[PDB]
Amino acid sequence: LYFQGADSCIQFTRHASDVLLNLNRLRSRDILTDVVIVVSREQFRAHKTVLMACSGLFYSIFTDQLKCNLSVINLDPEINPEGFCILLDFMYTSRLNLREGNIMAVMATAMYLQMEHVVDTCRKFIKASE
Amino acid sequence: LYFQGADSCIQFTRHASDVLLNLNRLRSRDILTDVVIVVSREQFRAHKTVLMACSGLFYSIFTDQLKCNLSVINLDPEINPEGFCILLDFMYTSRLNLREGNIMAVMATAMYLQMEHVVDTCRKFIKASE
Ligand SMILES: Cn1c(=O)c2c(c3cc(Nc4ccnc(Cl)c4C#N)ccc31)N[C@@H](C1CC1)C(F)(F)CO2
Ligand SMILES: Cn1c(=O)c2c(c3cc(Nc4ccnc(Cl)c4C#N)ccc31)N[C@@H](C1CC1)C(F)(F)CO2
Ligand SMILES: [Cl-]
Ligand SMILES: [Cl-]
């Protein structure tokens, strides 16, 4: 449940994961979602704070004085919707559903979105299959 | 960095804590904060999604069709501002700064805010000092 942290302060082991679980439940129920990400013919509702916390691209967009107030964000039409969906799920769950059939699209999408450790992980899995 | 989850899916160990760290950085810079919590003469800016994810009281308030749109929320004037501050910091960090001089106020505030495991932890620490 809790432990003594290195800073001599009480820390709750599952707190961060339980907060993320609740943020994903709010997303699933469309509660307090404040942006729709458009990827070709597909739309994905989300919370800007979670997107900024998980992506260098979204962090840049939503800290821009003009774009921070947009309710619709259109991604590059070359982005694969399934690749984006897999990464949005990862943002809200810490689970990345990589498969042989989606890894190239997930990697290209993570490069565009500036999610470096995901890109590095994709490169390592690709290197193992060559 | 990552591991094979029980659901045979790749999971990133530090993802949830790193997201929470970024949400606290946005709070510290007042980025995308969408509510001010008023506690007697003190004001605390925050993100409604994080408050709802961490409190039964805030979850009820921000799911109410009328209150979900309020930009200012006034707490009961009997709530101690320091106790609220300690709990808001806990929400964004997983670290609870309990001390002999603040534990009663933190416990009463956590009861009001419906943060059960925090209340239980406070009760256990109080029981040890009697
Ligand atoms: C480059 N980059 C990544 O490669 C990356 C990111 C990531 C996040 C920001 N956002 C921030 C940076 C710094 N400060 C502030 Cl307030 C914010 C905010 N808000 C920026 C660049 C990023 N986030 C992680 C999650 C934390 C775990 C991710 F795994 F989802 C993908 O990897
Ligand atoms: C009663 N109660 C607590 O006692 C409690 C809570 C807590 C949260 C909600 N919020 C939700 C519930 C269910 N579903 C959805 Cl979408 C939401 C949302 N959003 C409700 C009741 C709660 N949150 C945890 C953090 C998760 C770790 C806390 F540690 F900060 C304090 O303990
Ligand atoms: Cl302990
Ligand atoms: Cl592994």
> Most extensive chain contact?
A-B, 39 and 39 residues
Assess the beta-strand content of chain A as a share of residues. Answer: 15-25%
Quaternary: homodimer
Record field, number of beta strands of chain A: 6
- Radius of gyration of chain A (Å): 16 Å
Brief sketch in words of this structure:
The structure is a homodimer of 130-residue chains. By secondary structure, chain A is of the alpha+beta class.
Write the layout of secondary structure elements.
Two copies of one chain form a homodimer.
Chain A: E1 2-4, E2 10-12, H1 15-28, E3 35-39, E4 42-46, H2 48-54, H3 56-63, E5 72-74, H4 81-93, E6 95-96, H5 103-113, H6 116-129
Parallel strand pairs in A: 3-5
Antiparallel strand pairs in A: 1-2, 3-4
One chloride ion is lined by residues 2-4 of chain B.
Question: Would you write up a description of this structure?
Answer:
The structure is a homodimer of 130-residue chains. Chain A is an alpha+beta fold and 130 residues long. Chain A has one domain (1-130). Helices cover 52% and strands 16% of the residues of chain A. Chain A has a three-stranded mixed β-sheet with strand order 4-3-5. Chain A has a two-stranded antiparallel ribbon with strand order 1-2. In chain A, helix 2 crosses helix 3 (56-63), helix 4 (81-93) packs across helix 5 (103-113) and helix 5 (103-113) runs antiparallel to helix 6. Chain A is globular. The A-B interface holds A 1-2, 5, 7, 9-13, 15-20, 22-23, 26, 31-32, 47-50, 52-54, 62-63, 68, 90-91, 94-98, 117, 121 and B 1-2, 5, 7, 9-13, 15-20, 22-23, 26, 31-32, 47-50, 52-54, 62-63, 68, 90-91, 94-98, 117, 121. Strand 6 of chain A pairs antiparallel with strand 2 (10-12) of chain B, so a sheet runs across the interface. Bound molecules: the ligand Cn1c(=O)c2c(c3cc(Nc4ccnc(Cl)c4C#N)ccc31)N[C@@H](C1CC1)C(F)(F)CO2 (2 copies) and chloride ion (2 copies). One chloride ion (CL) binds at residues 2-4 of chain A. It is classed as transcription. Keywords: Transcription, Inhibitor. The assembly is dimeric. The entry is titled "Crystal structure of human BCL6 BTB domain in complex with compound 1".
